[PDB]
């Protein structure tokens, strides 16, 4: 019940995913659809699978190898083992597209007047960028916040292969009016120095 790992690669690269105790069956799953079987019995190819996929055993571990990566090969790959009575699925490796670094466009939004009447206020901090690693730090009158904000990252875009993040700071109307300055400090790989977008209540 864990989150898959990442692996950046471009079209035409050679990817070898290692699985970490019986034989390993490899599965490919695209987002929003059912998984598909690729390799069974360590190194036997399933029917209809392209010949670029291949499995191999290395001592005690098992590896899935894509000789030449293709555009339709970007998905999550799971390895499945079978014990005496329990079938277990691996962590899963999500192969993403590699792109030049891109800095995000930072935007901040104060809560609307139609929202303050409900009793709660939400401040949204908007971040297209690459890679996925980014830090969003909320500041309320130069007081570091933590725990009262949630992040949401979109999937890799189909045209430019970039990510989009949204951090929503949730506060009550009583606590929102008790302060003046609200800011979200963004730290990204493509930025030599952090960028801060702020506003006053």
């Amino acid at each position: 019940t864990q989150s898959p790992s990442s692996l950046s690669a471009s079209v035409g690269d050679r990817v070898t995913i290692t699985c970490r105790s019986s034989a390993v069956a490899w599965y490919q799953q695209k987002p929003g659809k059912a998984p598909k079987l690729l390799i069974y019995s360590a190194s036997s190819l399933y029917s209809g699978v392209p010949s670029r996929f291949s499995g191999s055993r290395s001592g005690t571990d098992f590896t899935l190898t894509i000789s030449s990566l293709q555009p339709e090969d970007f998905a999550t790959y799971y390895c499945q083992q079978s014990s005496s009575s329990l079938i277990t699925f691996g962590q899963g490796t999500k192969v993403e597209i590699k792109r030049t670094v891109a800095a995000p466009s930072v935007f901040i939004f104060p809560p609307s007047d139609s929202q303050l009447k409900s009793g709660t206020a939400s401040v949204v901090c908007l971040l297209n960028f690459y890679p996925r690693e980014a830090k969003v730090q909320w500041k309320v009158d130069n007081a570091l916040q933590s725990g009262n904000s949630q992040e949401s990252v979109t999937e890799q875009d189909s045209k430019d292969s970039t990510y989009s993040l949204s951090s929503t700071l949730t506060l009550s109307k009583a606590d929102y009016e008790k302060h003046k300055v609200y800011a979200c400090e963004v730290t990204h790989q493509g930025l030599s120095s952090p960028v801060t977008k702020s506003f006053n209540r």
Binding site: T1, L86, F89, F109, S112
Partner: protein, 212 residues
């Protein structure tokens, strides 16, 4: 040819029960095994249980004392009885076909795995009640906050604006309600053309058009 159709999923209170159905067709039901594999929102695959039509059953240690799998050989359908459901069991439940004696065939050189999978069914375990969303205006956008359950679809100008639009995946707030934002970048010289985001919540019959 071979087809596996899941059904029975829905909404259930914490502590309730729900029976899932895996209607199989296109093969000899007695010569294979039917497994249940769930997948939490944004996480990996988790095997739950299996049955071999011989009552060869097995359960994962996380659903031992509250899940029960059965089958009906005359209907070619497998059943998964889930009792004492908790918030951790919220996932998309697939059923797949495997070898009949996979425990006996499992060795250091063989692992047939699961050949045919179904599109799965959604099972949501939450104590929250169905509630419509409250849209607030926010590059511009509109905030869709506090609604239940999934899903919701946001469009701009009745689907006219789709290039450069980002509708973020919903996140489960600590209060049990969903919330997401939909942003879109437009030229600055066209601010003073109107922009309307279209929010539709089918599990509650709520359509809201807010002008930004």
């Amino acid at each position: 040819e071979v087809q596996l159709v899941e059904s029975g999923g829905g909404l259930v209170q914490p502590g309730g029960s729900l029976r899932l159905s895996c209607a199989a067709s296109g093969f000899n039901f007695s010569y294979y095994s039917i497994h249940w594999v769930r997948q939490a929102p944004g996480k990996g695959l988790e095997w739950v249980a299996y049955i071999s039509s011989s009552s060869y059953t097995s359960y994962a240690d996380s659903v031992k004392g509250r899940f029960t799998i059965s089958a009906d050989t005359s209907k070619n359908t497998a059943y998964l009885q889930m009792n004492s459901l908790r918030a951790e069991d919220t996932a998309v439940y697939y059923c797949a076909r495997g070898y009949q004696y996979w425990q006996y065939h499992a060795s250091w050189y063989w692992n047939g795995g699961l050949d045919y999978w179904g599109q799965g069914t959604l099972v949501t375990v939450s104590s929250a009640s169905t509630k419509g969303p409250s849209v607030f205006p926010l590059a511009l956008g509109c905030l869709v906050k506090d609604y239940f359950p999934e899903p919701v679809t946001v469009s701009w100008n009745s689907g006219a604006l789709t290039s450069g639009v980002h509708t973020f995946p919903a996140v489960l707030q600590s209060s049990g309600l969903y919330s997401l934002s939909s942003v879109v970048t437009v030229p600055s010289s066209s601010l003073g053309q109107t922009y309307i985001c279209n929010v539709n919540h089918k599990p509650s019959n709520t359509k809201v058009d807010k002008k930004v």
